[PDB]
């Protein structure tokens, strides 16, 4: 996926969705907060 910036209060350690998919990770080094977003994908319609 793609790692973006997000600003929420994350005092609890490490990682989170309805489907329990992870939305943030605590970096083992340079401890900060990142966000995970799936790669852009979509259906293709072939008009002819």
């Amino acid at each position: 996926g793609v790692l973006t910036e997000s600003n929420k209060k994350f005092l609890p350690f490490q990682q989170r969705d309805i489907a329990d998919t992870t939305d943030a990770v605590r970096d083992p080094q340079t401890l900060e907060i990142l966000d995970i977003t799936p790669c852009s994908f979509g259906g293709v319609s072939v008009i002819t």
Binding site: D17, A19, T21, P38
Partner: protein
């Protein structure tokens, strides 16, 4: 439903007709029902007061 479903394959194809066109159709039906009567549902319309 906001974005988790949209990020697990689940897509929502938009409806073919937008709300504005549906509103235009309803406005047309009202216009015919008011200024025409039941005629406009059977071909050409006729004008008759209310």
């Amino acid at each position: 439903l906001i974005c988790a479903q949209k990020f697990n394959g689940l897509t929502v194809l938009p409806p073919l007709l937008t709300d504005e066109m549906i509103a235009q159709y309803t406005s047309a039906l009202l216009a015919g029902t008011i200024t025409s009567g039941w005629t406009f549902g059977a071909g050409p319309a006729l004008q008759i007061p209310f």
